[PDB]
Design an enzyme around this catalytic site. Structure first.
Site, short mmCIF file in Angstrom:
data_model
loop_
_atom_site.label_atom_id
_atom_site.label_comp_id
_atom_site.label_asym_id
_atom_site.label_seq_id
_atom_site.Cartn_x
_atom_site.Cartn_y
_atom_site.Cartn_z
N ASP A 92 16.42 81.53 -51.56
CA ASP A 92 15.29 80.85 -50.94
C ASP A 92 14.80 79.86 -51.99
OD1 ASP A 92 13.77 82.34 -52.84
OD2 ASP A 92 13.54 83.96 -51.38
N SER A 93 13.88 78.98 -51.61
CA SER A 93 13.38 77.96 -52.54
C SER A 93 12.31 78.50 -53.50
CB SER A 93 12.79 76.79 -51.75
OG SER A 93 11.60 77.18 -51.09
N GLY A 94 11.72 79.63 -53.14
CA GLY A 94 10.69 80.22 -53.98
C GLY A 94 9.28 79.80 -53.59
N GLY A 95 9.18 78.83 -52.68
CA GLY A 95 7.89 78.34 -52.24
C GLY A 95 7.01 79.34 -51.52
N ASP A 146 9.83 73.62 -49.76
CA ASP A 146 8.78 73.11 -48.88
C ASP A 146 7.43 73.74 -49.16
OD1 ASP A 146 9.32 75.66 -48.00
OD2 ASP A 146 9.57 75.13 -45.89
N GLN A 193 9.34 72.88 -39.93
CA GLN A 193 7.96 73.35 -39.98
C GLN A 193 7.25 72.87 -38.72
OE1 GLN A 193 6.35 75.40 -42.01
NE2 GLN A 193 8.22 75.73 -43.21
N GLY A 220 7.96 79.13 -41.08
CA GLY A 220 6.62 79.26 -40.55
C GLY A 220 6.38 80.36 -39.53
N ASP A 270 17.29 87.42 -42.38
CA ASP A 270 17.07 88.11 -43.65
C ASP A 270 15.74 88.83 -43.48
OD1 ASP A 270 15.41 85.41 -44.39
OD2 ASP A 270 14.75 87.08 -45.64
N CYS A 308 25.92 106.22 -35.83
CA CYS A 308 26.16 105.48 -37.06
C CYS A 308 27.42 105.93 -37.80
CB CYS A 308 24.95 105.59 -37.98
SG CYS A 308 25.10 104.56 -39.43
N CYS A 310 28.11 105.00 -40.94
CA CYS A 310 27.94 104.84 -42.39
C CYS A 310 28.28 106.11 -43.17
CB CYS A 310 26.52 104.36 -42.72
SG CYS A 310 25.30 105.64 -43.10
N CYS A 313 25.68 109.05 -42.93
CA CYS A 313 25.70 109.84 -41.71
C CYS A 313 26.95 110.69 -41.59
CB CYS A 313 25.55 108.93 -40.49
SG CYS A 313 23.89 108.23 -40.36
N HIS A 339 21.95 103.69 -45.34
CA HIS A 339 22.01 103.88 -43.89
C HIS A 339 21.34 102.74 -43.13
CE1 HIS A 339 21.45 105.27 -39.84
NE2 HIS A 339 20.15 105.07 -40.00
ZN LIG Z 1 24.12 106.00 -41.05
#
Ligand SMILES: [Zn+2]
Ligand SMILES: [Zn+2]
EC number: 2.4.2.29
Lengths: 372, 372
Positions: A92-95, A146, A193, A220, A270, A308, A310, A313, A339
């Site tokens: 990300d830009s950090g803004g 931005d 924006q 935004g 994200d 699931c 994973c 699980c 998980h």
């Molecule tokens: Zn799982």
């Protein structure tokens, strides 16, 4: 592979599924990016993040510049080498963090000056410095810097911030383009924006398209407006962005939000929800999230989620994880986080498949019926 | 494999190397047992513990009885299934922790009553209840329940505690033997007491041998007497124990202590040092431990240790781990802990090899020269 190449393989309504090819790897879209705050996806080794299905992770420029430091990471070989993740990384830009995490912030047309939340050190950020820091980190997908607009916002303020953001978008583009190695190996995304105002979103979209970016983020949102409002804004906002480029909805996680966003044309996401909620005791399941700390799970031998696939699980019970979290054991955080991230990736896979098979609408319907 | 079978393959002076065969697996000696406090070896998945080379881990009966609870674990299928470790598990009796961790302790010839340090709940422990709890946990190597002797100790008090401990050893033996499934599938170790007094150590040893156990632990050491004194006590104490059974030095970790103990006939060890020190920032290396938080490691690209073959040293730099620990990141704890446990296992391997090759004395010498 090429520096950047987005291709759409299938569509259903406004929904799209495809791939983004970059030098470090292929990204399947719609995609969810686990968040690696300070050069680490909390409680997980990079190989574990990859095992869940993640094709790319996100890095926070604000945190990284504060510690260990941008220049230090570059000297050490870059973020990829530093943390052990060799696939794409979007920074990300950090803004956003400057505004929400730092103090004594001084904003101007040039940029922003602020003090760290870790100590009292002084720091500066601008389109040029942000782009420079992302280069030092060795970011694959660079976000233009931005100025964010707090919610709620007045038409006047939203316009001013959006206008300044567009001016900063051009500066970001030029900064990125003037750095040969970065322009040739990385990609640059612009950020739309305009708050919840259609006319401003249109102006931002046009300005962004005018400059030209590899991808466009919808900024935004996810700042307190509520899903209803967010969806309404997406309804008219996403169509304004170039159809042949990726659409990235920043900070939006939470299963239902993601499904609705994809239904509205979003390709990338994200969110800290998976990781953070995992450490706090919230585990995602197709029947909705559960709070593993609840006494009802004390002797529950079943896995976090009945479907699931994973590793957590397959091997541990809700009862064990319940004990771990209540005891404050690190393994509790590790398992819950693995998980949840796996759950999110499985959600993205089901979304990609259903779209490719022309049954996404039904999936969204079936998903909500059970999830709620 | 058999219920229990200890075989010595090679010797050098008082040092021995061999194997302990049990139903759940083979244990190579000298052996180091990672400590799994509350059904978890802090910050590590069981498979990772196994990857470092561990053949067996230790479980704390005191902590487990407090939470999640002995009966609960049994209902859930036992500790092995609960935490995901299918190899041998040795459980302490819980007596040491009662004295050092609990409060309002009431001791008697029958046992000890105490209050949890977690809450105000009341709990009880005795030879019979301790053995019963270890059975519920499904322990492979059961430790007899005894009464520890604080350091320093007077001849009179040391004698009384040792005498009570021997009476409790007989009760432990009978309790264990009366439980068919336990007597047939697990092993029972007796614990030698007597403080630093040779005559008492001899009496304890004779009483223990008289009763008969599968292994003998040397208790009462590593509680503040110092290495010099501990070694002196081991010099005359270990020879009193049956030569054909394993000798277990409880609570002794720290590289140099282990090497010296093996030189004096010890076959098994356990210590929280590896794990705890790892989380605090101390990493073991053949050149001695280093404090990864020190500024000198901020840009050190080398691995924790130049020779270590663990996964952490193959993939991450001191610089990265330095950042992780200073930032309080969970992955910092995970990596430091994995490396330290791997380091300890590599130490045990080098000890086993050197003894089998008749060059242990030289190894001990070379080890200390570089380590210090
Ligand atoms: Zn799982
Ligand atoms: Zn290592």
């Amino acid at each position: 592979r090429p520096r950047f190449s987005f291709s759409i393989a299938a569509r259903e309504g406004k929904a799209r599924t495809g791939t983004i090819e970059m030098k470090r790897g292929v990204i399947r879209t719609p995609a969810f990016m686990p968040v690696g705050t300070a050069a680490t996806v909390k409680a997980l080794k990079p190989e574990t993040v990859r095992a869940t299905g993640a094709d790319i992770i996100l890095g926070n420029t604000y945190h990284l510049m504060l510690r260990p430091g941008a220049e230090r990471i570059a000297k050490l070989g870059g973020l990829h080498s530093f943390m052990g993740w060799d696939r794409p990384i979007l920074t990300d830009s950090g803004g956003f963090q400057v505004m929400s995490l730092s103090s004594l912030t001084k904003q101007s047309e040039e940029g922003v000056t602020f003090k760290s939340h870790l100590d009292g050190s002084r720091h500066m950020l601008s389109p040029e410095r942000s782009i420079e820091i992302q280069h030092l980190l060795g970011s694959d997908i660079v976000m233009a810097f931005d100025e964010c607009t707090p919610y709620p916002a007045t038409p006047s303020r939203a316009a001013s911030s959006m206008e300044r953001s567009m001016r900063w978008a051009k500066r970001s583009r030029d900064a990125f383009d003037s750095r040969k190695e970065q322009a040739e190996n990385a990609a640059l995304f612009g950020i739309q924006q305009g708050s919840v105002f259609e006319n401003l979103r249109q102006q931002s979209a046009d300005a962004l398209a005018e400059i030209g970016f590899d991808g466009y983020a919808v900024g935004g949102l996810a700042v307190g407006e509520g899903q209803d409002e967010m969806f309404r804004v997406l309804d008219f906002s996403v169509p304004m962005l170039p159809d042949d480029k990726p659409h990235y909805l920043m900070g939006v996680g939470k299963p239902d939000d993601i499904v609705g966003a994809v239904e509205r044309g979003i390709d990338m996401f994200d969110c800290v929800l998976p990781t953070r909620s995992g450490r706090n005791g919230q585990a995602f399941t197709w029947d909705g999230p559960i709070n593993i700390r609840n006494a009802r799970f004390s002797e529950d031998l079943k896995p976090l989620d009945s479907e699931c696939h994973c590793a957590v699980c397959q091997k541990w019970s809700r009862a064990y994880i319940h004990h771990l979290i209540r005891a404050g054991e690190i393994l509790g955080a590790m398992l819950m986080t693995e998980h949840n991230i796996a759950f999110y990736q499985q959600l993205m896979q089901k979304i990609r498949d259903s779209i490719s098979e022309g049954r996404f609408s039904q999936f969204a319907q079936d998903f909500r019926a059970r999830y709620f």
